Amino acid sequence: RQWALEDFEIGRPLGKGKFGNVYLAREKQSKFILALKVLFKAQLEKAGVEHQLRREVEIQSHLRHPNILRLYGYFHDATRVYLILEYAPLGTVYRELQKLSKFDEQRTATYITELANALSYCHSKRVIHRDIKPENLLLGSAGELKIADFGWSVHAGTLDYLPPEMIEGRMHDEKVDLWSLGVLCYEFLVGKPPFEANTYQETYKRISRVEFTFPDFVTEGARDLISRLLKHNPSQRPMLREVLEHPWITANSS
Ligand SMILES: Cc1nn(C)cc1-c1nc2ncc(Cl)c(-c3cnn(Cc4cccc(C(=O)N(C)C)c4)c3)c2[nH]1
C-alpha cells in the first residue's frame, strides 16, 4: 500500500552518511515509531547502484527474523526516495563499541550467536549479506542484535571486513559471511579489526596473507574460534552450526 511524506512526522536525525540521511519518524494515524531513511535519486543514478536499492528492498522486505531489521515498505517523493525501516531503540553496536572500548566475552559471544542465527536464516534462503560491519548492527528494545543494511546483498570500497576471495575479485559464496563473523568477533574483543592499517594498499595485503596477531588478554577459547573463521581457504571455514556448537560460544552465550 503506497505511502507519502505527508503520512509521517519527521524527528531526530539518527545517523548521517554521504548516501543520504536517516531520521526518526512517526506515522500520523497509527502513531507508529519507525526509522525513515532518505535517499537522493541524483547520487543514486550517479553511482549507478540502482540494483542495490532494488535488491535491498527486494531482499530485506521478505526476510523476517528477530535479528534482522525489518523493512516495512517504501515510496518516493518527486525528488528523493524514502525508505521505511524498523526503529532500533538502543542504537548501533558501533557507538556501543566506541563507548565501552571493548566488549567482554559474554556480550561478545552473545552477539555472535544472535548473528549466527540471523545468518543461518539468511543462508538457508540463499542470501549473502557480505557487508557485515558494526555500523550495520543495531540493538532492539531488549538489547538484541539486529542486522540492518542490505545495500550490498545478493544471491550466490572499505576493506576491513572483506574476505581474501572477495577483494581479489574471485567468485564468492555464503562463506564470506563466516569470514566477516570472525573479523567481527575479533573487533568485539580487541576494539579494532584484525587487519586494520593506515592505507587501503597495506590492508589489502594483510587480508590476502591473513596476517593478524592476538593481544595477551584474548583467551584461548576465543583465539581458536577466530582462527577457524579466518582461514584463507573458504572450505576450511566452519558451518554456522558448528560455530554455535563451539565450546567458547556455548560456555559464553546467553
Ligand atoms: C543512533 C541511535 N541512537 N538511538 C537512541 C537510536 C538510534 C538508532 N536507531 C535506529 N534504527 C534504525 C536505523 Cl537504520 C538507525 C540508523 C541510523 N543511521 N544508521 C547508520 C549509522 C552508521 C554509523 C554511525 C551512525 C550514528 O549516527 N551513530 C550515532 C552511531 C549511524 C543506522 C538507527 N539509529
Side-chain angles (χ1 to χ4, degrees), residues 71-79 81-124 127-151 153-170 172-190:
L71 181 54
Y72 296 143
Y74 84 103
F75 67 102
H76 48 289
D77 185 4
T79 308
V81 168
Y82 302 142
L83 257 71
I84 308 173
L85 291 155
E86 174 187 356
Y87 172 66
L90 270 64
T92 71
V93 179
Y94 179 80
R95 227 210 188 172
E96 184 66 14
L97 194 57
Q98 15 153 338
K99 303 300 183 179
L100 295 192
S101 184
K102 342 163 189 79
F103 293 161
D104 54 67
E105 309 187 70
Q106 186 43 230
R107 180 195 291 260
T108 300
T110 308
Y111 284 153
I112 298 302
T113 304
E114 294 170 318
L115 243 181
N117 301 340
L119 282 179
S120 195
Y121 177 97
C122 285
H123 283 183
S124 57
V127 192
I128 314 96
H129 188 278
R130 27 186 70 193
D131 209 34
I132 295 185
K133 315 180 217 203
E135 330 170 6
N136 295 329
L137 300 179
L138 305 175
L139 302 178
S141 64
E144 76 269 29
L145 189 140
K146 290 184 183 299
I147 308 174
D149 209 328
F150 282 80
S153 180
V154 294
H155 318 270
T158 59
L159 285 188
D160 282 325
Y161 304 86
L162 296 187
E165 47 262 29
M166 189 166 301
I167 64 178
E168 296 182 351
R170 317 183 223 154
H172 43 264
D173 61 336
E174 312 181 341
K175 280 292 187 180
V176 310
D177 287 335
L178 270 298
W179 174 278
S180 310
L181 189 55
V183 171
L184 211 61
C185 179
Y186 186 102
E187 188 180 355
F188 282 168
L189 296 180
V190 186

